[PDB]
Amino acid sequence: NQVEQSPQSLIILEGKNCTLQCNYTVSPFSNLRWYKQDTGRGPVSLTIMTFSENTKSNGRYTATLDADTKQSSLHITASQLSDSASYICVVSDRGSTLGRLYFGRGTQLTVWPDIQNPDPAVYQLRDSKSSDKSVCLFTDFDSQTNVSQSKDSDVYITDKCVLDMRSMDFKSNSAVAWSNKSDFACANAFNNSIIPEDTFFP
Amino acid sequence: DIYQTPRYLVIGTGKKITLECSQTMGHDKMYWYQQDPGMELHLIHYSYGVNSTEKGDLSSESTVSRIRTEHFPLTLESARPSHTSQYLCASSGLRDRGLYEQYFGPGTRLTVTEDLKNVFPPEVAVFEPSEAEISHTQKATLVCLATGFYPDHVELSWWVNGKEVHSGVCTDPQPLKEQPALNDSRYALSSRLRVSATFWQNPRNHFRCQVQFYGLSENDEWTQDRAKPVTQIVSAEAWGRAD
The missing domain is CATH 2.60.40.10 (Immunoglobulins)
Structure with missing residues (x-):
């Protein structure tokens, strides 16, 4: 060129x-x-x-x-x-x-x-049973945390996304993982990724 | 302004295709570009005015016509997978200063597929905020999931109390492929809507995840004995939960 x-x-x-x-x-x-x-x-x-x-x-x-x-x-x-x-x-x-x-x-x-106060956590999100799925949400990690797509055509991990709560002056990153297969739990949903040591697993 | 139709087009192979392009700024020079997602803009045809027709630095299975100053339709021949990508129309008028500014249309995202039997609308599910998040952060995150769709012709939006929202929303830039070893893999897309905990706890608040799917038309031939995967809205809803 x-x-x-x-x-x-x-x-x-x-x-x-x-x-x-x-x-x-x-x-x-x-x-x-x-x-x-x-x-x-x-x-x-x-x-x-x-x-x-x-x-x-x-x-x-x-x-x-x-x-x-x-x-x-x-x-x-x-x-x-x-x-x-x-x-x-x-x-x-x-x-x-x-x-x-x-x-x-x-x-x-x-x-x-620029996330000054990271509060990394992996939450489990219910509702549905509309979907024979289980949705995990990794959220509030700082922008240096890299989210890696997992290699199971059963286990799906989205890349990270920034959401902006304009009226609160608040921004946050998040990545969503899910899988229909029963062998799945949020405790190890993001295993392939390096989540911070202090990640809140409820 | 400058216009393009269709915005989305899924078509089987070997079929004729016409992408419409209109401009009402009275501009003389008009262009057509092809762009693969993530790649450069390749010029394919252009026009100087009324009856001008020229080719670009890339030759393709395509022709254009400029009968009128307003319309600059593009024709793609025997539909071939390769056509899958975005086609951008543009025109340049003398903005001022002796200089021509380029103006681009919204574009046509084209997918060309072996068999239309591979076209499927998405499924949509919404997932409520975890109690743990609510108590720990005083915030509440809804997740929307669109899955099982082909092709990637989707637009996701969130509606709260019947009005569309953008604050507190993030949608995946790129979708996922259900099975990434197959040509015509179906897709999944995810989106988050985040609100205050108290907002979520009001059972009068109504939340909707809407996915507009662009697929076949009613005119398109369908022999597949399942519902024709036509352009449609698929949706999922939740309500605030007092707890």
Whole structure:
């Protein structure tokens, strides 16, 4: 590709800044853009810059260009959850109807919450017997805890998810495991994962 | 704005397909992109105006037509698994500054499958908060489970007292494959709704997990003697529990 992006992917906590990189070999050069693409949606144009402009801002998004060295950076200030998305560098060779657009492969960005007071626990959730299942919920662990998918087509483990209780100023991570088979209990549902030592098992 | 239909399409192999794209901003240049989930945007066709038709850096089993400035339909030929992915329509108009801004449609997520007999709607279950969580945290987490569905054409939403909520909700970004060794594996998806303990303890509060499933149409031929896996809503509910 004539447009390469760096890094391939990164994971950051909310509150922090980060910088994505675009390098190109497109010649001639007319303008450079940064798109944001949310999962399942179409890209949104964040910023356009011409060869003679250094820098362009859109909210907490600030793009930088050095046409001399064929390099642009997108800097994100005070990252929040919704920043989680794929960011695409696109370069155009000519500034008019006849120009072609060149898309980088994009950088995947994930933004996890900053959990100051973790309270890891594995709860069992009832109701149903609608489902011949048993649902376990691993919750309130901090963002460094990694949730590993288990290798039983009986035992299903989702990856981790951030939920935001806006009116309480409270955020939490959670992962859901379940299995119809009887040989299953929340005590060992998350065995394949490294849960914190102090995890509350009721 | 710019529009795309259908949003979701499941189709058996070898069948003709047309993806509609409309734009009412009066834009001249229009584009079609193909994107595999997690991958780059490959340009496949474009148009300069009224009667322009060109090919992109990827040649496929596809054609487009620009009869009018508004409509830019795409045609996919003898349906082949490969088509499975997202097709994005876009147009660029002179936003200002001498520059053209690109605007994208919502897209079509296409799945192409060997046999339609492999299409199944999801099952939905809701699970109430554990007493342990309630007492330990004064919070209460409902979990919703959608399982047994093919293809991955699903939209999960939570309704409390008949109004849709987004606060306190997290849905898996990606679904799970029931059996990850099979081409047409069915899927499962999970979501959490978290509320205060006192909210949960009010037995007047009503909770609904709703899953919109996109499948076959009533027009589509069905020979399978089971219920046609048509586009439908599958749902599950719980009520607050005084305890």
